């Protein structure tokens, strides 16, 4: 009789990691309990700058202090943008679903750094530190978070539970949503930053179960130029399906 490999959740997330040649973790978080995920577990309490998925914070401090509205159409006032599909007027939830990042510098500036700073303190998001570059801070450093630090926050913006008003924090939630089947969603944000070294890419988010339990996650990994995006959303749902999330 032959022996047999049990491939457990465990192991086959961290082979999943493995297959693409990379480093990462993801972060689950449900009921106050947070277990780790993935080939390379010291990721999740290493900083890494939050790109892309600062726009949740930043769309949560620009609503908050009454600079935007969820309703306000933004300008695409002519420059060339890194991608076709932003050169158009749209909301901050159509830019969030885009990532459009020239739209939240617009509103980074707007905030200002003096409010943006205060802001950030007031969250205690990752190390809160945000230089003197209003329009960068979360693309190239200073600002860094962990991606526990992470879980941790997109589990109380899930909740209700950020020190913001309850009607922001639910309609930043409402740009968030990336899926819907069979009685579950999905909502997120990517990050991606390019232009450092190693890049580091980012999905955080949670699934909503069709009984109303929330599972929180932040999947954290070192990307390369070679890879294409999708690679984190790939890798994030087949391990929510291994580990019965979905
Ligand atoms: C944010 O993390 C990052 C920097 C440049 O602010 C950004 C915008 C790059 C990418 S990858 C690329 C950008 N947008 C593409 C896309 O998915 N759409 C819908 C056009 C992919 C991201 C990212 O994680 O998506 N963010």
Same mark, same amino acid.
Not at 40 to 58: D, G, H, I, Q
Not at 103 to 130: C, H, P, S, T
Not at 210 to 239: C, H, Q, T, W, Y
């Given at each position: 009789t032959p022996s047999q490999i049990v491939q457990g959740h465990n192991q086959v997330i961290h082979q999943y990691f493995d297959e693409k040649n990379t480093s990462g973790v993801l972060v689950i978080q449900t009921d106050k309990k947070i277990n780790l995920y993935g080939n390379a577990l010291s990721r999740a309490n290493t900083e890494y700058v939050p790109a892309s998925t600062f726009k949740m914070l930043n769309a949560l401090i620009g609503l908050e202090n009454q600079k935007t509205d969820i309703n306000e159409i933004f300008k695409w006032k002519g420059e060339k943008r890194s991608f076709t599909a932003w050169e158009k007027d749209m909301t901050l939830g159509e830019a969030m679903k885009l990532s459009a990042v020239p739209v939240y510098q617009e509103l980074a500036r707007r905030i200002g750094l003096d409010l943006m700073q205060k802001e950030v303190k007031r969250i205690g998001f990752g190390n809160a530190e945000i230089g003197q570059q209003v329009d960068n801070f979360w693309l190239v450093g200073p600002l860094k978070v962990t991606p526990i630090q992470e879980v941790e926050f997109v589990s109380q913006l899930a909740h209700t539970q950020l020190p913001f008003s309850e009607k922001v924090q639910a309609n930043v939630k409402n740009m968030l949503l990336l899926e819907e089947s069979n009685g579950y969603k999905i909502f997120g944000k990517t990050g991606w930053a390019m232009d450092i070294k190693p890049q580091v890419g980012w999905?955080?988010?949670?699934? @909503?179960?069709?009984?109303?339990k929330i599972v929180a996650f932040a999947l954290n990994m070192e990307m390369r130029s070679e890879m294409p995006?999708?690679?984190?959303? @790939?890798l994030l749902m087949?391990?929510?399906k291994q580990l019965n999330i979905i």
């Amino acid at each position: 009789t032959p022996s047999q490999i049990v491939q457990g959740h465990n192991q086959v997330i961290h082979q999943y990691f493995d297959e693409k040649n990379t480093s990462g973790v993801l972060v689950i978080q449900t009921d106050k309990k947070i277990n780790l995920y993935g080939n390379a577990l010291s990721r999740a309490n290493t900083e890494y700058v939050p790109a892309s998925t600062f726009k949740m914070l930043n769309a949560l401090i620009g609503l908050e202090n009454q600079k935007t509205d969820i309703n306000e159409i933004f300008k695409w006032k002519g420059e060339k943008r890194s991608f076709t599909a932003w050169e158009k007027d749209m909301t901050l939830g159509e830019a969030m679903k885009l990532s459009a990042v020239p739209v939240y510098q617009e509103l980074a500036r707007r905030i200002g750094l003096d409010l943006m700073q205060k802001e950030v303190k007031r969250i205690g998001f990752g190390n809160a530190e945000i230089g003197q570059q209003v329009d960068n801070f979360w693309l190239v450093g200073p600002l860094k978070v962990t991606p526990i630090q992470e879980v941790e926050f997109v589990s109380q913006l899930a909740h209700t539970q950020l020190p913001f008003s309850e009607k922001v924090q639910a309609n930043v939630k409402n740009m968030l949503l990336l899926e819907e089947s069979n009685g579950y969603k999905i909502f997120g944000k990517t990050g991606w930053a390019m232009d450092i070294k190693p890049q580091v890419g980012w999905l955080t988010g949670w699934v @909503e179960q069709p009984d109303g339990k929330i599972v929180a996650f932040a999947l954290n990994m070192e990307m390369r130029s070679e890879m294409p995006a999708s690679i984190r959303n @790939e890798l994030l749902m087949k391990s929510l399906k291994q580990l019965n999330i979905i």
